[PDB]
């Protein structure tokens, strides 16, 4: 059929290939009456013209270097290769998309370096007493999962600038805590004390040697200290071959950008390190607080996993901030900070359970679509991250790159990096928009009507208008006009009244607001969907008036989103499993459910209604719907057989289940704020003793048999 290569083209190899993603060119001379050299490969094969000169380039995704993923990591971390392939080469033809697959695995043990940045507010004074014996416990606990550990310690108070400091009286400069008759040191923005090291004794000695300062404003500028620690890698010694942890602990609000106006500081914050050998931040009194964007950018660049430890008063605020900065884990800190070790262990366990990918050095010319795949063969389209993972779990991803037009660079590169991991994939794309035959050039050939034109792979392009096949029609010649050679289905204006019927074809004109092409000049630019000045919605590109999307978009208007990252819930189910996701918005099919992911519902049925199969499998390893393997497929809660029945769980509810044995089993469901859904069940439920009839009827029939035997022996004697 006409297809699209043959139509809207037939001018040169460049256009012939550029009109549609797939086309074939018959360089060898053949019959020109059939409009060849631009059609499906099969059509050209039917028409022959395959003397090994066929120009049908196909996109390739050849892998340059690839190595197997290491099973375990104990030494020689330089070649962990936890992410494969390391680097690939891609060659995509113009207006074509190609996709590849990658895998992400956690190689068991991995060295970890943790920096503990703590506030020294007055209310934290007591907490300072609970850290004097934390190094040994932390080392012992972390030894189970990690063999090599590095620990660094740093403390901060607040920004030393008025009015945050008690300038008066003059004696209060070296002792602001004079009203309460206490000992304190001058306020400091940031004071690194212990660099990263594997010596627990050094950490123990460092603690208990500091003190607690005083401040007026409740908010504490910990962002400055966090940024200084992140950027001053040399000062503390970040190791690129280890997992970077930053435990930030405070018990008060935090300042934001442009908050220095009160103190008179107006200079925008800079990410350059300003920490010298004195172990102090000189620019503390002259540098404004950093902005969230810069903080997040630096955190991503340095691959630092930030863990907040704050009290319940500001836990909601820190949770709200956490969802903004990627790779952040929140926690609850007690007043005495007696659960710091357990909290940090839980945060370390949780952070490794979340995997996310980031794109860097990505030009806007091309676009990427991501598909995620957790354990098992289940695949979630339009997703780049997986949840509910564990140590050693492996996940898969599919990345599809689509290019638009032909960028005039011929060499582009970008990187896909998982969060908190040195290893990342480097993808290089090269654009080959020029046909190989064009290398022949032949600028002057006698076949162009006695050498008065240019020749290119069987087509003579000549002069500023000479378009004839033999390069003879010219632009001023061809005065006589023919019929049935400029428009189809005679009975309509020639060239749709847009162009001139010359050289036997419709030549388009009025090259304004774009470019006009096509055999009959029917496809044109500057005719795309517009709302207030945009073109093609600003995402895709319009061909022949149809605004085709790029990657990550679909629809005629190309405003509906395809990626489901925004509409992904924390329970591993799209929109919490209570609704679908369309154009990045959750629609709750189930009535009575609303919210961002339909999770916020008051009147939904209790969980135990649909948890029967899980408890049945746990307690008996049997039940209905066992073929589907629903025992452990949706219920991630942990089931425990405990006969307490007296737990004082705030977010805990009793419920009952009915079994075929006719004994009701009562069990508790506790949904902790941390998300650790736990079921408490009673093993061997006490079925009331019912059977009291078999013995009675056995005795009755025995008595009847005895009476019968007595009658029989009486008859015998009689």
């Amino acid at each position: 059929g006409p297809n699209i290569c043959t139509t809207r083209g037939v001018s040169s190899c460049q256009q012939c290939l550029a009109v549609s993603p797939m086309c074939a060119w018959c360089s060898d001379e053949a019959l020109p009456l059939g409009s060849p050299r631009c059609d499906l490969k099969e059509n050209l094969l039917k028409d022959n013209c395959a003397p090994e000169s066929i120009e049908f380039p196909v996109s390739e995704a050849r892998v340059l270097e690839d190595r197997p993923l290491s099973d375990k990591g104990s030494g020689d971390s330089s070649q962990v290769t936890q992410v494969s392939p390391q680097r690939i080469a891609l060659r995509l033809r113009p207006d074509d998309s190609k996709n590849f697959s990658i895998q992400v695995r956690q190689v068991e043990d991995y060295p970890v370096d943790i920096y503990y940045l703590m506030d020294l507010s007055y209310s934290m004074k007591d907490d300072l007493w609970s850290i004097q014996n934390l190094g040994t416990k932390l080392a012992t606990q972390m030894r189970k999962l990690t063999s090599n550990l590095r620990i660094g310690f740093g403390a901060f108070v607040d920004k030393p600038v008025s009015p945050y400091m008690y300038i008066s009286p003059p004696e209060a400069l070296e002792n602001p805590c004079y009203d309460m008759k206490t000992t304190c040191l001058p306020m400091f923005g940031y004071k690194h004390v212990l660099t990263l090291t594997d010596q627990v004794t050094r950490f123990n000695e460092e603690v208990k040697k500091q003190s607690v300062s005083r401040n007026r404003d409740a908010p504490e500028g910990g962002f400055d200290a966090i940024m200084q620690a992140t950027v001053c890698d040399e000062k503390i010694g970040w190791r690129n071959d280890a997992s970077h942890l930053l435990v930030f602990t405070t018990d008060a609000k935090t300042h934001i950008a442009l908050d220095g106006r009160l103190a008179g500081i107006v200079q925008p914050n800079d990410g350059q390190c300003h920490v010298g050998s004195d172990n102090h931040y000189s620019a503390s009194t002259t540098m404004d607080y950093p902005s969230l964007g810069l903080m997040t950018e630096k955190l991503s660049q340095k691959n630092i996993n930030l863990i907040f430890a704050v009290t319940e008063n500001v836990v909601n605020l820190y949770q709200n901030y956490s969802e903004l900065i990627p790779g952040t884990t929140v926690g609850v800190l007690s007043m005495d900070s007696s659960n710091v070790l357990q909290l940090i262990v839980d945060a370390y366990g949780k952070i490794r359970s979340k995997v996310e990918l980031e794109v860097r050095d990505l030009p806007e010319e091309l676009s990427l679509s991501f598909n995620a795949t957790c354990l098992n063969n289940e695949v979630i389209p339009g997703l780049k991250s997986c949840m509910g993972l564990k140590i050693g779990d492996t996940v898969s991803f599919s990345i599809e790159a689509k290019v638009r037009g032909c960028p005039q660079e011929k060499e582009k590169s970008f990187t896909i990096k998982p969060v908190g991991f040195k290893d990342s994939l480097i993808v290089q794309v090269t654009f080959d928009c020029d046909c190989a035959c064009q290398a022949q050039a032949e600028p002057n050939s006698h076949r162009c009507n006695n050498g008065n034109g240019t020749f290119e792979c069987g087509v003579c392009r000549c002069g500023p208008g000479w378009l004839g096949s033999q390069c003879e029609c010219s632009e001023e010649d061809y005065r006589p006009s023919q019929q049935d050679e400029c428009s189809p289905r005679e009975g309509q204006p020639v060239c749709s009244q847009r162009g001139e019927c010359l050289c036997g074809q419709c030549v388009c004109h009025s090259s304004d607001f774009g470019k006009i092409t096509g055999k009959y000049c029917e496809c044109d630019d500057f005719s795309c969907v517009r709302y207030k000045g945009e073109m093609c919605s600003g995402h895709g590109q319009c061909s022949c008036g149809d605004c085709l999307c790029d990657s990550d978009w679909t629809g005629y208007y190309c405003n509906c989103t395809t990626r489901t990252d925004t509409c992904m819930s924390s329970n591993g189910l799209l929109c919490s499993g209570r609704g679908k996701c369309e154009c990045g918005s959750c629609v709750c099919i189930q009535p009575g459910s609303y919210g961002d992911t339909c999770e916020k519902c008051p009147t939904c049925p209790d969980a135990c209604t649909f948890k029967k199969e899980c408890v049945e499998c746990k307690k008996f390893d049997r039940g209905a719907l066992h073929d589907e393997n629903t025992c452990n497929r949706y219920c991630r809660d942990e089931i425990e057989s405990v006969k307490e029945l007296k737990d004082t769980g705030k977010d805990a509810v009793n419920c009952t289940y009915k079994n075929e044995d006719d004994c009701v089993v009562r069990f508790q469901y506790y949904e902790d704020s941390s998300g650790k859904s736990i079921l408490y069940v009673v093993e061997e439920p006490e079925c009331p003793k019912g059977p009291d009839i078999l013995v009675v009827l056995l005795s009755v029939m025995g008595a009847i048999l005895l009476i019968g035997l007595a009658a029989l022996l009486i008859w015998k004697l009689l």
């Binding site: 964007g293 005719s527 009575g592 509810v653 009952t656």
Partner: protein, 946 residues
Amino acid sequence: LNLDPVQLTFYAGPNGSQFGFSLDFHKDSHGRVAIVVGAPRTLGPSQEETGGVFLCPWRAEGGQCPSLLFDLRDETRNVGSQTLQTFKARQGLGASVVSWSDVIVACAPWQHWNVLEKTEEAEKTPVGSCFLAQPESGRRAEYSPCRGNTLSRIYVENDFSWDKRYCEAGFSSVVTQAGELVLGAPGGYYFLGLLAQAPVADIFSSYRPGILLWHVSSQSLSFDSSNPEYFDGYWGYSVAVGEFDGDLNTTEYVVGAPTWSWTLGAVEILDSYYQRLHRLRGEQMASYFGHSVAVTDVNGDGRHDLLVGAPLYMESRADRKLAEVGRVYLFLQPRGPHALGAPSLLLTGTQLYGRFGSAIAPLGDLDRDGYNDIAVAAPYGGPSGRGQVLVFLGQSEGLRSRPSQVLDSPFPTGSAFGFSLRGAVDIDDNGYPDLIVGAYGANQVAVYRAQPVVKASVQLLVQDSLNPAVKSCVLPQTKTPVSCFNIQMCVGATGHNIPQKLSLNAELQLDRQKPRQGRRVLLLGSQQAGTTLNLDLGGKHSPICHTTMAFLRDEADFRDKLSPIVLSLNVSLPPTEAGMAPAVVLHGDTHVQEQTRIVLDCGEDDVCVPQLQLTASVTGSPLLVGADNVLELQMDAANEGEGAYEAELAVHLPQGAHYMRALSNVEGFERLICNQKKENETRVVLCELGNPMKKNAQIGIAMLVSVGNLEEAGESVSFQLQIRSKNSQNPNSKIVLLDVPVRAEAQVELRGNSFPASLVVAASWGPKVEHTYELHNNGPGTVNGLHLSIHLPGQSQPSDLLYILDIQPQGGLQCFPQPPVNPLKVDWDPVLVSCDSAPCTVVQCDLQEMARGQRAMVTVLAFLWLPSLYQRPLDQFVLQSHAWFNVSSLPYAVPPLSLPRGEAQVWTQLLRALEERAIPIWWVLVGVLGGLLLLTILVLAMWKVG
């Protein structure tokens, strides 16, 4: 728009003084205009930073400016046993500078005030102050509303109540038309924020030299609030004045609090008595929403509109899901006292970390188009991140998203250009406002002078059709008859204070579509397809019209006949003469095109008389207010006469309508094209039906129209449809009018659920049970007079099976039970029971207002009465609760149509472990008796027979 980025005036001051941090215009008694600038780091006489103020006169070249003289020496006083000390070191004088009539007020928030008394002291804090100067009378005065003689211990014993030691007053100073200076103190009341309002005349008349501490009779400050949301709110970062209630007696104030509500950002609109008239919340936390607040009538409707900024706003991008670019919000005041709704318009920056929207400066009617214009400054916008200024013009619908003009920062990196902007003052007296932009990083001020704006209107008239047979004229210098026609071009320039002498170049091109050698028509005089003329419009208020004669080449010279002839007229400014700097900027209809054709198929009379008929149908009659209403309009056009030239479909839609899609049922490759444009106030849609069509041609077009929110459109909306043609005879067909009725209806859903679903009681206080009912206004519309009644068994008595422990409503609904629930304080075969049979307790809930999207919750906590539970424990229990809800009226003009009703039933069933009900052994007894009878009869039969 017309701002000239070439001819700029540069003002410079001492290096390192952060000159240009704040700037304003000042007008003297004679009308002379000067620029007041404040440098917060000017070196004082004692080689210390104290700040200063500069008064730059209007100089075409600029340069150094005189510096105002203010006291910069510490003042110490002793009253009784108290000692008052003032320290102006690093006071940042000139941080905020304002002008009013002949008074210049420059504030230093960082000035330190200290009180000493023997041993105890009030601590040294940056209370700040404001210096007022009147150069005309040469008067000076000081203002400081947070000066006191209270010791720190007094505040400590009072829980820091009325703690005004950290006011930092003067951060944002505003002056009303009445001369009442209002200063903002975000740090007042221990980092909560406050305002201080005082007449300037009273301050001048109530100031005595040497009196550090004084109280003004008219001094008034905002009342402290104990709400935790205001903690660390810094309320008072930006302060503005405006009118919102419609009464000129009161002057409403707008205050921005970026850190209000745990770093959320908000804008509070208050009356003259510090009463919260309205509040607007931010979109995202840490966005610094409310950094700058401006009042301006952008739409021109007569009601002031609000502009807010959020430099720290974070957007979403394909490369990264988070990008800090800033945002600007526009709110339009609705008619009447209606509270402000969602933001009228949203503007987002492009450059990363550009802090867009930090400074917003009204510019009035820069282009004299009847609509106010504004400027938004990005400190680090643009590709180079050196700062930029975007000018937004006003319109009836609000502000255009696309910036009319963009001005870059000539200063190098670190200049912080665009930090402070101000305008709407005719400093140059040219009839148009100018702009002034400071740069503390570069320590300079750049003044941009606006240029006159001229509107150009171009009209072209030419014969609709040409007759080659008729040849009236004659070629010059020969006697060869040839067809001819007249082309008329009218050009008109309009404006205000336009230069007395103006020149323009008009280029007329004939058959521009065809090549120069292939042109079919030419000019009678020059015998060329194109010509250029110079028109002097200086002082010619009325449009200037010119006429020319054109002829058509011989038939044998060309063969194309159906191709139309295109005539184009282009108006342009004269080429840049010596010195460049064009006097005025010309915009408007600077290029027009028309198309004609030769007489063909118009009959023997040679005059085409088309006759067109149009029919229209509408689908989607039910229109709901506040819903995505979509109407399908099908228009069928037929031609019974001769072909119509340039036939198009013109559709006029209501204000809230919009054009989305349009297809043509007839033909699969027609490729219909439609466009939408604002003529005067409504978005008219023109669809190109086609060039001259063949006889008996019918075309059908189906289009989708989206209707937005409408509250004053009336009972029904109206749509107009017509056929537009350029033919001399019957240019347009009959006008088609379609009336679509509008009806408002809303649906409200009631749901209920009881927990736990299954409850087991073994064998005081029993197990807890909670019943929850939710009412949701899912419908797009709104309802009023929402009434609900919930009936439950029992009367909350010991004899009752269930005892209502507590009831909690949520959502503002007013609920009352009957009889009273929970009489005691309490410091802690299924059987169907319902209100109909068992004693009935009815709780009635009312809601006068119920906005769309809100949900009302009612929860009841109870337990099963254990004393009653013990009795007859072998009978199953299934209790029922019945909820019935409806509404009274709706907040819409349309009476139709009642609705909605709602019924809900909640059933809770209780179970016991292996009830002791009488097992049906009676069947066992019957079977045993039957077996015994069978055995006995068999024995008798086999024994009697023998």
